[PDB]
Design a protein around this ligand. Structure first.
Ligand SMILES: CCN(Cc1cc(Nc2nc(C)cn3c(-c4cn[nH]c4)cnc23)sn1)C(C)(C)CO
Length: 252
């Protein structure tokens, strides 16, 4: 399908940022409700993101999993690039965190397992996300977690492992670190290496400097400590995470 802007009715902006915005849209003929990511050619060229755009297109159109946000197609005009995406009705895990302050162990272990299954799928197809964070985690109508924004995927520093921040060689174990950061943030309400400056955060990540509040459970402390390892090869496999006692006891 060729696809033009005239085929869609644009609704409210779902999210705003650099490069463009994501809108709720409806295809005119089918009445199909979707998410329309409107990216400006001006900012894409003046940053060299053209490759990352192709990677999001290629990866998300070819990946098919219930915990991964679908990409149905794309189009462009003189000014903009339009990505036709699956719409996630229950919004971002980021927004849910702000509202709830922090999550219980049941919600956390459910989200971590859903993320691990999707990441296991990506990793079997040699796809590494590298940008796993609450803003990129979306919720379906049954409250199921879905990974979006595969732009930074290849085959703030808050969620980045020491390998990436230090500019070293990296692999699938990057997403394992990010999962450990997410697990802590879901339970605490703030990421483990948060600091008021980039220089401070960088320092905390490279040295793996984090502490647990009293309310953090032994099993949760255990899982997080296994994921948050400076050494990439020391981080467990996704199946070891899915087999973790704290995960099997609290997940759904
Ligand atoms: C207006 C009340 N809401 C609905 C809602 C639904 C949203 N859906 C989406 N939000 C954002 C940013 C991005 N989205 C994509 C996407 C990301 N990358 N590529 C595609 C896909 N679906 C969304 S936001 N709020 C509540 C009740 C969930 C709370 O807020």
């Amino acid at each position: 399908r060729q696809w033009a802007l005239e085929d869609f009715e644009i609704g409210r902006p779902l999210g705003k940022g650099k490069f463009g915005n994501v809108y709720l849209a409806r295809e005119k003929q089918s009445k199909f409700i979707l998410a329309l990511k409107v990216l400006f050619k001006a900012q894409l060229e003046k940053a060299g993101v053209e490759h990352q755009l192709r990677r999001e297109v290629e990866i998300q159109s070819h990946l098919r999993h219930p915990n991964i946000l679908r990409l149905y197609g794309y189009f462009h005009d003189a000014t903009r690039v339009y990505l036709i995406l699956e719409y996630a009705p229950l919004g971002t895990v980021y927004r849910e965190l702000q509202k709830l302050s922090k999550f219980d162990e049941q919600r956390t272990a459910t989200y971590i397992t859903e993320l691990a299954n999707a990441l296991s799928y990506c990793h079997s197809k040699r796809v590494i996300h590298r940008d796993i964070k609450p803003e990129n985690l979306l919720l379906g109508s049954a409250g199921e977690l879905k990974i979006a924004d595969f732009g930074w995927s290849v085959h703030t520093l808050d969620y980045l492992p020491p390998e990436m921040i230090e500019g070293r060689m990296h692999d699938e174990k990057v997403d394992l670190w990010s999962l450990g950061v997410l697990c802590y943030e879901f339970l605490v309400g703030k990421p483990p290496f948060e600091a008021n400056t980039y220089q401070e955060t960088y320092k905390r990540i490279s040295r793996v400097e984090f502490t647990f509040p009293d309310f953090v459970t032994e099993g949760a402390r255990d899982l997080i400590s296994r994921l948050l390892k400076h050494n990439p090869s020391q981080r467990p496999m996704l199946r070891e995470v899915l087999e973790h006692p704290w995960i099997t006891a609290n997940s759904s």
